[PDB]
Design a protein around this ligand. Sequence first.
Ligand SMILES: Nc1ncnc2c1ncn2[C@@H]1O[C@H](COP(=O)(O)OP(=O)(O)OP(=O)(O)O)[C@@H](O)[C@H]1O
Ligand SMILES: [Mg+2]
Ligand SMILES: [Mg+2]
Length: 367
Amino acid sequence: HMQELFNNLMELCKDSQRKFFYSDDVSASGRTYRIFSYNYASYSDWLLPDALECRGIMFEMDGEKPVRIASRPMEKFFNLNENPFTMNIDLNDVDYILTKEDGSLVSTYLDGDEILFKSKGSIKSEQALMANGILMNINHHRLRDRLKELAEDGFTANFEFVAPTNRIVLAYQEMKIILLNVRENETGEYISYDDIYKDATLRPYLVERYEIDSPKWIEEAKNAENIEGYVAVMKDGSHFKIKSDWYVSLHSTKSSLDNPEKLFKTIIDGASDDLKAMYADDEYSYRKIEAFETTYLKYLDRALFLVLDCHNKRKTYAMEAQGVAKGAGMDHLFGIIMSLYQGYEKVMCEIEQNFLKNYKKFIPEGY
Ligand SMILES: Nc1ncnc2c1ncn2[C@@H]1O[C@H](COP(=O)(O)OP(=O)(O)OP(=O)(O)O)[C@@H](O)[C@H]1O
Ligand SMILES: [Mg+2]
Ligand SMILES: [Mg+2]
């Protein structure tokens, strides 16, 4: 049930502050919501219970009690061959593949009598309030009424918000929302693509689908231009993504595998999952990216512990924050501990830049 699921997620947000976290917002109606998301996480983190559902799922709260799963976006999923989840796939068990739109996730939720969108991490993000604007206009009144009845039966409708102002790599003419999928809020079951298609009000918005008969579609997609790629939907309802080399080479920093300050840049932007799957045919470059990956996560772990723990507990702290920084070799994390005296997020921004400058120290041994 839901209470079980809410607990498993709360557990994750205690393990470390850059693995899993949450955040509470309040809505216009005055209701209280809690969003479970994530910042960084390695394959083992994703083995923790229900860790794969800690990407924007949102609970309406009552104090510290979940009352309902107000919004259910997709589970975390990975690129093919990115890690042990997505290696040894029977490509013959791909049901079909879906165009991958380049934009931002927005997911429905009911707030009293109002059907609204939340971005991945917030119900007040720019994308959230614009998506809201879009849904309340007269052109989307048929769809708004259908998503409102879906919410009321407790489903979550998931859209990719695209726009020329919100351009990531691909270039979209108009601002619009594209219906990706629909999820039952409690069980997380997906509505079948064919049911969404039968609704002629939803059919206009629904992401294009392609049938496949040979795994040759992956080579074609890897070698295509001006597309991000595809989301493959398995016969069991799980999903794996295939991005084009073209997209990945444009979404990473330039010369990533050559300049180690570039590779680390790729990692601090969360783009090294696409890169790793791009070099999955190259055992050396594949396992090298994992090295630099672990390095930066090992660091973050240590760093974030020391910075926040110290600042949990006056010139006392000043001299005491020096014992943590110098005691761990990184005197860079001293002005960082000055933050909790000044103001808090804004922090994680600073730990990154400070890593790239001393970066030469952390470069894995043998690389
Ligand atoms: N047809 C589609 N089906 C599913 N997801 C899609 C589709 N088109 C675009 N997406 C987007 O793909 C995202 C997941 O793949 P992507 O590599 O873009 O993730 P990300 O934004 O880097 O974050 P993460 O690594 O945490 O998944 C989803 O957030 C979703 O908004
Ligand atoms: Mg995307
Ligand atoms: Mg990624």
